Design a protein around this ligand. Sequence first.
Ligand SMILES: CC(C)CC(=O)c1ccc(OC(F)F)c(O[C@H]2CCOC2)c1
Ligand SMILES: [Mg+2]
Ligand SMILES: [Mg+2]
Ligand SMILES: [Zn+2]
Length: 326
Amino acid sequence: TEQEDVLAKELEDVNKWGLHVFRIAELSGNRPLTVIMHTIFQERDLLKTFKIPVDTLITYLMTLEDHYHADVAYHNNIHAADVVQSTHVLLSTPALEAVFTDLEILAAIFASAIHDVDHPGVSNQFLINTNSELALMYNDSSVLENHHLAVGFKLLQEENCDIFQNLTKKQRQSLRKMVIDIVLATDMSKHMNLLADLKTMVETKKVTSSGVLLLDNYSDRIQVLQNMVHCADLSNPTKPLQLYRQWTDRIMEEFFRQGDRERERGMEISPMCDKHNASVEKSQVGFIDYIVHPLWETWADLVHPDAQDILDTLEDNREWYQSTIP
Ligand SMILES: CC(C)CC(=O)c1ccc(OC(F)F)c(O[C@H]2CCOC2)c1
Ligand SMILES: [Mg+2]
Ligand SMILES: [Mg+2]
Ligand SMILES: [Zn+2]
């Protein structure tokens, strides 16, 4: 009850950017995804809205969480929980108030939860270069992201795991399509085109009487949800520094382990994966400058000024990492 009391206290921050997700992972007995998803579903009244039995939700979440690899440093259940919670916060931004339906909200949150499930800790390119079964199955195209979807949906069919059992056929059809569109958009090979389209939307942005974003067709609606989850996936450098540094520690461990496998095969070691020749700090500054800040600056423009503090933190963290180089 004492550890449970402390966990409940920490979960009171579920609506805040910079939640202590690593603390929650420890306090929950390595069940951050289950406890954070359960909390968010309760917070958003999703169990009642979609008639989800609580035991079914918990059973699915525990099984989903189990299919993240405990021995992968970055792409594990803590990352999934973090992306879920970040998406949850982004969904609540004033500029999107009443924009999305309950089904669309469910899609975005569910997509976030499953988006990296059964990740092996190596990149799509590694899987392609090594002639893996995954790459063979998926014809070198969004190899991991296709797999995450297949696993996430497949687990719904396990005993007492169908959390969507009380949705209508049309609701299930719509949800499935939206979730596929969102998770496939987390493939970094799609980033530049996704960002280009987001910029176009910002340039042509329209708002309602209430000052809320106007999205009146599927293409625009799904595009915003795709970029939202993608922003959440790329949110580490926008978090308070003590969180960001832990994420960087973890991704570098994962990258180095891949580089060790490439070194042992006689392959050229991938960028940033050589533990004997890797500038962690320069790499983060480049990551922010070329990928994360261009994305987040554009998201911030879409919802201006809702995300100014997130953007300010990103810029501060970029400055901090840069300062360690000279
Ligand atoms: C974006 C993709 C979906 C996951 C990814 O590759 C990823 C996520 C977070 C990273 O850093 C930090 F925020 F934790 C990261 O750093 C690499 C790249 C630059 O130097 C090392 C890579
Ligand atoms: Mg596992
Ligand atoms: Mg991924
Ligand atoms: Zn991810």
